Amino acid sequence: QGIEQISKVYMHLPQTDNKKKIIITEDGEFKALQEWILETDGVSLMRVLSEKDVDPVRTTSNDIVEIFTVLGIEAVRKALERELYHVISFDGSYVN
Amino acid sequence: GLQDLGVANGEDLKETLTNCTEPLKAIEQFQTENGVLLPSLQSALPFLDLHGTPRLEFHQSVFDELRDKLLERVSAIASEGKAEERYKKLEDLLEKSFSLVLQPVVMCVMKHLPKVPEKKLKLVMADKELYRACAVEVKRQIWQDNQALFGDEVSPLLKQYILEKESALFEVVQRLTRMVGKNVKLYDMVLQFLRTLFLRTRNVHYCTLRAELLMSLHDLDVCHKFTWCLDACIRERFVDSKRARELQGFLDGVKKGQEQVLGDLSMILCDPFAINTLALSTVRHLQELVGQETLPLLLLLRLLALGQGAWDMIDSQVFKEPKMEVELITRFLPMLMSFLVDDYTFNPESFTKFLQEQRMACEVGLYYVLHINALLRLLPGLVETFGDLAFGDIFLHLLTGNLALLADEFALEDFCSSLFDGFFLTASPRKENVHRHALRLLIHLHPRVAPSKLEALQKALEPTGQSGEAVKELYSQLGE
């Protein structure tokens, strides 16, 4: 059972606002909804989306080579932007 | 004004209260009363609004009529045109027409009035069509304007085409409105009107009808679809070969019929942009054949199709024109001679005169493409052929070639183009005279022909009695 090149996968509720999903409550408010998300220490991407019930819009990884081979150079541009910004502003320090 | 049951009752009440007592309270009670309005609200209105007007109630009734039209549209979209909803809408429209002489009734008729047996009677009653003929697209827009408004648009369409031709020598919204007010019978009437306009104009109306049909097929069209696709392919790539091959295959696999192929060929022939694209494609095919060195082959089939399209307007209920392979080879022999002269330069006259004497749209297009020692000899032969032809389309192509030569900026070529433009302005009508005046205003960059060009423009304005020629002479005098 399962897919290949994947180790034991953890799950959690993202307490942080950006990672937990946000909906537009119709009065005009951004409401952050906490919901169970998964995290694989062994990435098998596009196979994780070949599997059922997964969100294709919100699925993102921490590698660069595979998303270069699949999602393209502008996508890995935005992804490396997000990852490097996260790593630098982990301690709250801002960079431009 | 409008005389409904309530209007007649109000008129009778006014006539009865004009005299014979008619006290205020009893007269008001016998004349009018508000069923929806509460008596307490009616009593409190005089003490608060100071005899307020019923305009707020009228605006509320107008909003309720708009909401009723929206509910009728919702019912027609949910039940798929329910019979009970359609009957209720027709009854409401008839009541509104009987009461008010009718914005809500017109809105209801425009929202849902399909197959109105009483809608026909309502149109016959409002056969004047001051505002309702344009407001009611269901009745007035759909076959109501076929008798008179269609002819008025056809005359305005011809005027717009003439104005566009004048602007080119010096529509879309109407077609979109005609397509919006279109049905099966409306499309049949529009096709008949386009055929009549094409027969009257000798090709301009056919080109306009073909353009309108192509525009509808691009947006809201629904062998006509294949013809529209072929026309769109030709417009996208006039020099393209796949679209031409598809059109030739469709023409080959199109069975003979009663006037349908004749009308399609007539549109393809007297389509001006289509004619220019076909001439450009024929010139490209001739250039490719000359490059390959395999002259006689789809070029002969394309030339035969162009000749059949040209003859479809001349003769009705015809199949096509003769091929004439020997004549095509004789015509292409001057092209081979011109190519040999160009090769000799980079390393005849009797045939050109014969081709100019013969009436040929393909020959005129070849002369226009050529205009746009051996080369010098071929150029005088091409000029002689153009002078022997002396057609309006040939004159327009010669004006385009003269503009191209002026853009090229050759001295001797400029002098020859100025002489040809003067001859064409002398021979042709006031439009050709104005074109020659513009070509002479752009001409005479050298000082040896500038005063001569001004004298020729003055002599053409004086001898040309046309108002366009006089305006061109005045513009030339003002410019220089």
């Binding site: 307490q15 169970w36 | 008001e28 508000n34 069923g35 309005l37 307490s40 609200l41 409190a44 608060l48």
Partner: protein, 534 residues
């Protein structure tokens, strides 16, 4: 003699008066007579009503919309400059017509909009509300209860509704009753006098005194300082020193050792006062706050005095024969003192093996009710202290079994136990494993299903339906609750309980709930019993 009008027949009296007595240059009179240049507005409204009948909606919705539009137009162009003048001038026909037909929301809307002018109109509206069989169902405004008759009648209707309903009505309509019986303190005092006479009447006196207790509590968080006033209504005002000391202690909201020695000394006596001054629940709430706190250790010089005061408050009885006490009991206050003293020592030493070894004796004390809810609120404070969950063996089994034993021993503590459990379930604890939080919520549901087994089933299923409708929790938690409830229930079934447990049972993955039952089919038998009942 003008004859120039199209729809001016509505203003016919004014037009006739203007035509009769215009004189000079009647240009303005002619303009007023010919102002209605449009067609007959009433006939156009009748035609619009006929069109609405022929259209989609042939109902009275159009008439209701027209009445609402007329009321909105009146509210917009309300002549507030001379509304009082017009009302006090005429006051008969407009008020009479409004009360006869348009008494839905027009008068109440005008009163709640301004309520300062139009004294005659306000009096007419009050008279109409009094003459109506339903007493003031139109004028329910917190600032419009400044009239004695209207406020007394609204108080009568609200008290009748509360007494007709009961507990399930008590958790719903008491804020909207308290919002006008606590709006003005003079109205509060009048209501206190009325229902104090009602409590002096013996039958229903317990329920009335409970209403007085909760109104006094609501006034306490609202901002009233009516503890001395409640004491004045009570018999404790007969003794001036006792009344002054008790009022000062209630106003302070804490416990004073010198003042409580004074209370002990006027107590422990051969002629005790009537017990209600120590039976008032706000004073016992002060003892709850001061005594069984996890912190705030008392000096324990008068510890026996505190414990004896609690024993006298929660133990002794009396027989009121013609408002005279001649038979009292004092044999249970010693055991109550021993239990409360043991619990106070447990709260003082606050330590876990010895805590369990004394938890056995603590359960033996939990058999007492005052001990039970003191331990309940102590557990509430201890768990509600943040970062309490840093070590678990069965998701705080000692305190959660204290909850179970309290619910088992006393059925009346179920609302407070439910409030604590739903507060703990609503609070999200961070800095913990997601699976550990999941199992903690599961164990909270285990305790609340224990409450369902003890019989607080209608509010438990109600809270499940409420928390599933709003702030949707985990489907695994809902499935686990449903599976355990079907495990613990058995036929016969009450139709109300089946109806309350229905939609939660037939939504949200019944096939997901069915995992490994096999021997006993919970949901299939529930379907069979529901179809047999309904």
């Amino acid at each position: 003699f003008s004859t120039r009008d199209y729809i001016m027949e509505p203003s016919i009296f004014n037009t006739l008066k203007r035509y009769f007595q215009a004189g000079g240059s009647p240009e303005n009179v002619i303009q007023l007579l010919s102002e209605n240049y449009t067609a007959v507005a009433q006939t156009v409204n009748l035609l619009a009503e006929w069109l609405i009948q022929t259209g989609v909606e042939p109902v009275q919705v159009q008439e209701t919309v027209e009445n609402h539009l007329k009321s909105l137009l009146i509210k917009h162009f309300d002549p507030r400059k001379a509304d009082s003048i017009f009302t006090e001038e005429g006051e008969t026909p407009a008020w009479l017509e409004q009360m006869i037909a348009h008494t839905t929301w027009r008068d109440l809307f005008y009163k709640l909009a301004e309520a300062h002018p139009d004294c005659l109109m306000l009096n007419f509206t009050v008279k109409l509300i009094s003459d109506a069989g339903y007493q003031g169902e139109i004028t329910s405004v917190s600032t419009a209860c400044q009239q004695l008759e209207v406020f007394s009648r609204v108080l009568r209707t609200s008290l009748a509704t509360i007494l007709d309903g009961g507990e399930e009505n008590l958790e719903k309509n008491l804020p909207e009753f308290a919002k006008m019986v606590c709006h003005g303190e003079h109205t509060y005092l009048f209501a206190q006098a009325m229902m104090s006479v009602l409590a002096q009447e013996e039958q229903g006196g317990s329920a009335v005194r409970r209403i007085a207790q909760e109104v006094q509590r609501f006034a306490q968080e609202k901002g009233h300082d009516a503890s001395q006033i409640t004491l004045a209504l009570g018999t404790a005002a007969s003794y001036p020193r006792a009344c002054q000391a008790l009022g000062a202690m209630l106003s302070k909201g804490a416990l004073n050792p010198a003042d409580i020695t004074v209370l002990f000394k006027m107590f422990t006596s051969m002629d005790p006062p009537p017990v209600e001054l120590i039976r008032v629940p706000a004073f016992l709430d002060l003892f709850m706050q001061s005594l069984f706190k996890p912190g705030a250790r008392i000096n324990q010089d008068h510890k026996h005095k505190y414990i004896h005061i609690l024993a006298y408050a929660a133990s002794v009885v009396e027989t009121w024969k013609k408002n005279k006490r001649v038979s009292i009991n004092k044999d249970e206050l010693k055991s109550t003192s021993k239990a409360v003293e043991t619990v106070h020592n447990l709260c003082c030493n606050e330590n876990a093996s010895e805590l369990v070894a004394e938890l056995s004796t603590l359960y033996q004390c939990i058999r007492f009710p005052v001990v039970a809810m003191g331990v309940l609120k102590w557990v509430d404070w201890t768990v509600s202290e943040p970062r309490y969950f840093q070590l678990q063996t069965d998701h705080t089994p000692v305190h959660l079994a204290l909850l179970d034993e309290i619910s088992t021993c006393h059925q009346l503590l179920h609302p407070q136990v439910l409030q604590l459990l739903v507060k703990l379930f609503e609070t999200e604890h961070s800095q913990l494993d997601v699976m550990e939080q999941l199992e903690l919520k599961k164990t909270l549901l285990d305790r609340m299903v224990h409450l369902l087994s003890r019989g607080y089933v209608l509010p438990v299923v109600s809270y499940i339906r409420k928390c599933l409708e709003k702030l949707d929790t985990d489907i695994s938690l809902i499935r686990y609750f449903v599976t355990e409830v079907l495990d613990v229930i058995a036929p016969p079934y009450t139709s109300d309980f089946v109806q309350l447990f229905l939609p939660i049972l037939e939504n949200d993955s019944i096939a997901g709930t069915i995992k490994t039952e096999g021997e006993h089919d919970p949901v299939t038998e529930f379907i069979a019993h529901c179809k047999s009942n309904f």
